[PDB]
Design a binder for these strands. Structure first.
Ligand SMILES: [Mg+2]
Ligand SMILES: [Mg+2]
Ligand SMILES: [Mg+2]
Ligand SMILES: [Mg+2]
Ligand SMILES: [Mg+2]
Ligand SMILES: [Mg+2]
Ligand SMILES: [Mg+2]
Ligand SMILES: [Mg+2]
Lengths: 258, 167, 201
RNA sequence: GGCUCAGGACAACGGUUGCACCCCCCGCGGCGGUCCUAGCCGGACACCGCUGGCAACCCGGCGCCAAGACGUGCGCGCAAGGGCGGGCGCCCGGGCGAGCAGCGUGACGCAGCGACGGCCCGCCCGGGCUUCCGGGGCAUCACCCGGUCGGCGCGGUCGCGGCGCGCCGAGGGCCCGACGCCUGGCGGAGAAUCAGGGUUCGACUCCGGAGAGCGGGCCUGCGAGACGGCCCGCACAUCCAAGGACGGCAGCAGGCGCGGAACUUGCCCAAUGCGCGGCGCGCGAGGCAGCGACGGGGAGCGCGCGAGCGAGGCGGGCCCACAGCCCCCGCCGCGGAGCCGAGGGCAAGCUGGUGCCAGCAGCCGCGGUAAUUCCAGCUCGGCGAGCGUCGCGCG
């Protein structure tokens, strides 16, 4: 048993969806604690070197970050291993590139370019309501954020809209049947659909039944269901409408692209 | 050192298991405080550095504590005279060792100074006009460094009186 | 070797000198004497008679120093804690066992460390200068090519005054904001219930 | 981080639950009210100067001086713990499946923050334990356990618990194989073999566990019962100017011994990451090269009646942290096959020797004068830069 926490991470043990080459090396970046966890995040360096290709090595990323050339939720970050998660805001004013981090159908991270009208807020999921010191109510979110004195109408599992400049709630979408959702966990990551039914088993998980826009139906547990508006998404989403094609169609598309 | 790990015990069938690692620091214990009633010498409390930087204070000698009368809602600080009953062992009583659950005798001055002039439980008044009152210890000396408690009343008081009467 | 390089130091003049001793019988008046104990110079009749000295330390023949509460004429071993004399620690909480000569003075010593406390009117070959200067504000205030002078410390300059005032202002603002947020919340909830810690005093 | 698999067989480990019995550094987001000289407090030590001891290791005495160090500390009440505060057959908000959190109030106590302001809370990684199922062999081991099984009470612990102690009762496990003994016993993901069903192995790449000569103990720290941290006993070992002092390569190279059996005492952080920190440092982690018939893959010792082309050397590129190496470009141009066998299984036959001798032979067998089987020549067959022999597993 290791006498303390773990500071390394073998490349072969890294999450599958990060898409890291087997021969790249023995080691891989180790994300640091922050807004999101290890298995629900991705480091900055991977976005800035293996995707956008603005850097070729660790050193270039170090210089770019320490020069303060990237903003996260309106705040410059200088850690190459800082974790980037879901429904976050990515801005690079030098090239005027604004992205919101969402999930693709295949179950991997993607950058959705956006406008200036909606980059001042983010959507977050509320999953804990509790009493703090002196008995003052609080709440928490999927990005490790705490807000004091919320409205009583807000309950757990809901979704909250908050300005980037100020962490003040603007509007909240309830968790109810007939609302569009985005799956964010397991075999169905990235699929968009509307709720149809809710079944609860005492002392265990709660299962949600949704129907895609084209009629496909699927299930998952309530711990990975995210609300994105009332019958219509509040934010801009990737080109495809959360439709997971079959193997035949993907093979056809690959053949066309080749 | 002292430990409470279960590797050194036997199985439900009474068989020897065998040791597969050396001793570990999570599974350690410490020598008992053995809090003594005072009856150089004075209130002596020490401190212990526990896991995670926490601080645990155990008392070695003390003489005062806070006591309550629930029925009359009266609470003051008093002096403990001696211990007179303890279920676990009689040796503790002879040595006047303080632990949770010990039945002690307190002085009546802080209570009689305001009582004996209001209708209340008869037995408590009888104790008040005397020099001592039966009480109990509710805190855990050796873990918080204090000795608090409450005054007896009702069936339990009868139980303890019947127990210690012949002596 | 049968000798003792006696070291003499003067706090007032900061002058130190050493000599040599070739005998012991002249030093039977030195035996049985502990540290921090007066030792008359009558034994040293060559201009040190009528002068009082105090023993401060020494080293035995093998080099082992002399500890305080040993109260013995022989060196012994003991576990030395961090920060104790004659022990240099390598780790934060490392201990070490080593030999030290007992405080009691005896014929075995090859060195002696003695000071001068009270001297006779006669002068001796053995003024105190200063190599550095006080640096704190209080010190210099109490006491009144390249030019080198120490930089000053503990002195208040405007930026510190502004910093303290700003910190006070920010703290007051924070407390006021929390107070008004709480009051607005309490004004709300007119149709429900609350439980919070009342401010006493 | 790296090395190894000694120990250990309802354990470890693998899948699945829980903490309404828990602790948690960095980081992120919040919060921030503190009982009774504040234009800024006090004294030290380090290095350092003088003076010295001893072979070495080691340190002594005096002396002015610095802090985001140490100590005290200005300030709007606040740590831990404790007493009282719900119901009338059950069910039908802060939160729950679940009377759990918080608060008020009567008394104790002044913990933490504060001479450039953070105690505190939530999340995260991690750890501890814990439910259920699986988890080697021997019956020439059939009965075993006695804190062993439960209850009550206290102590101690981050914390539940026979974890420890006092009292009480008796209990628990077993042919659906207990207990005992053995193991040249780390486990899993996996590997070898090949119709289908299966058998054997699983040091070693990734995850987890355990250890640093054997056995124990402890400080610092959020976190270690840590050994490139200290203390003791035991077994070895070293230096001594003989009084004393000192050590732990199952880390990288190297050496002795052992065995059938296994490499350079090389260069560099440029790459992948780790620690510290702003325009970088360090890393025997890691990379590059050297040896290398464990081994795997791709070409070649000619085609043709004359031309062509390799390997090889000389120089330039490219690559490289520097060098190699592959590959590209001009000049000159080393063409090399062995290991088994020829009675059958099993594809493949001519003379000379020797004479149940010498020898061959996995089995049957040959050899006592043609020896189709030994020893040589010729010839021929198999595979091929590989071939044959020995032991193990699968078939
Ligand atoms: Mg105060
Ligand atoms: Mg301070
Ligand atoms: Mg073994
Ligand atoms: Mg391993
Ligand atoms: Mg270890
Ligand atoms: Mg150890
Ligand atoms: Mg070592
Ligand atoms: Mg180590």
């Amino acid at each position: 048993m290791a006498r303390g926490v773990r500071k390394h991470l073998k490349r072969l043990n890294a999450p599958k969806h990060w898409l890291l080459d087997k021969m790249g090396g023995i080691w891989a970046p180790r994300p640091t604690n922050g807004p999101h966890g290890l298995r629900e995040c991705i480091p900055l360096i991977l976005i800035l070197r293996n995707r956008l290709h603005y850097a070729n090595t660790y050193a270039e990323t170090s210089m770019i970050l320490q020069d303060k050339n990237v903003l996260i939720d309106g705040k410059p970050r200088t850690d190459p291993t800082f974790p980037v998660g879901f429904m976050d805001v990515f801005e690079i004013p030098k090239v005027h590139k604004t992205f919101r981090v969402l999930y693709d159908v295949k179950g991997r991270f993607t950058l959705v370019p956006i406008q200036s009208n909606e980059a001042g807020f983010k959507l977050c999921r509320v999953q804990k309501i509790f009493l703090g010191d002196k008995g003052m109510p609080y709440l928490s979110t999927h990005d490790a954020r705490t807000i004091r004195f919320p409205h009583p109408d807000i309950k757990t599992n809901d979704t909250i809209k908050i300005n980037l400049k100020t962490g003040k709630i603007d509007e909240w979408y309830k968790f109810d049947i007939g609302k569009i959702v985005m799956v964010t966990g397991g075999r169905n990551c990235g699929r968009i659909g509307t709720i149809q039914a809710i079944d609860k088993h005492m002392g265990s998980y709660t299962m949600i039944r949704m129907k895609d826009t084209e009629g496909t139906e699927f299930l998952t547990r309530l711990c990975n269901v995210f609300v994105i508006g009332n019958d219509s998404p509040a934010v801009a989403i990737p080109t495809t409408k959360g439709i997971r094609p079959d193997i035949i169609k993907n093979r056809e598309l690959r053949l066309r692209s080749i | 050192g002292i430990t409470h790990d279960k590797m050194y015990k036997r199985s439900k069938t009474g068989a020897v298991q065998g040791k597969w690692h050396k001793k570990r620091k999570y599974n350690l214990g410490r020598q008992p405080a053995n809090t003594k009633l005072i009856v150089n010498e004075g209130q002596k409390i020490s401190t212990i550095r526990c896991r995670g930087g926490n601080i645990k204070r155990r008392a070695l000698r003390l003489s005062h504590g806070s006591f309550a009368w629930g029925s009359a809602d009266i609470s003051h600080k008093a002096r403990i005279l001696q211990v007179v009953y303890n279920s676990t062992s009689n040796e503790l009583v002879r040595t006047n060792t303080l632990v949770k659950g010990c039945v002690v005798q307190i002085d009546s001055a802080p209570f009689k100074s305001a009582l004996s002039n209001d209708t209340l439980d008869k037995e408590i008044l009888d104790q008040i006009r005397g020099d001592h009152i039966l009480a109990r210890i509710s805190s855990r000396p050796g873990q918080v460094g204090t000795a608090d408690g409450y005054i007896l009343e009702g069936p339990e008081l009868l139980f303890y009186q019947k127990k210690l009467a012949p002596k | 070797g049968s000798f003792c390089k006696v070291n003499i130091s003067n706090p007032v003049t900061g002058a130190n000198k050493s000599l040599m001793i070739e005998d012991f019988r002249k030093s039977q008046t030195i035996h049985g004497l502990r540290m921090a104990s007066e030792f008359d110079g009558a034994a040293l009749g060559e201009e040190y008679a009528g002068c009082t000295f105090r023993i401060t330390g020494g080293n035995d023949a093998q080099g082992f120093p002399m500890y305080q509460g040993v109260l013995k004429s022989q060196r012994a071993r003991l576990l030395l804690r961090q920060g104790a004399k004659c022990y240099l620690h390598r780790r934060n909480g490392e201990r070490k066992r080593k030999s030290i000569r007992g405080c009691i003075v005896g014929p075995d010593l090859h060195a002696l460390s003695v000071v001068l406390v009270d001297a006779g009117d006669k002068t001796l070959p053995g003024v105190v200068p200063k190599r550095l200067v006080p640096k704190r504000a209080s010190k210099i205030r109490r006491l009144f090519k390249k030019l080198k002078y120490p930089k000053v410390q503990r002195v208040v300059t405007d930026e510190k005054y502004a910093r303290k005032q700003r910190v006070i202002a920010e703290k007051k603002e924070i407390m006021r904001k929390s107070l008004q947020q709480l009051e607005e919340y309490k004004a709300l909830l007119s149709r429900m219930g609350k439980q919070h810690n009342i401010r006493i005093y």
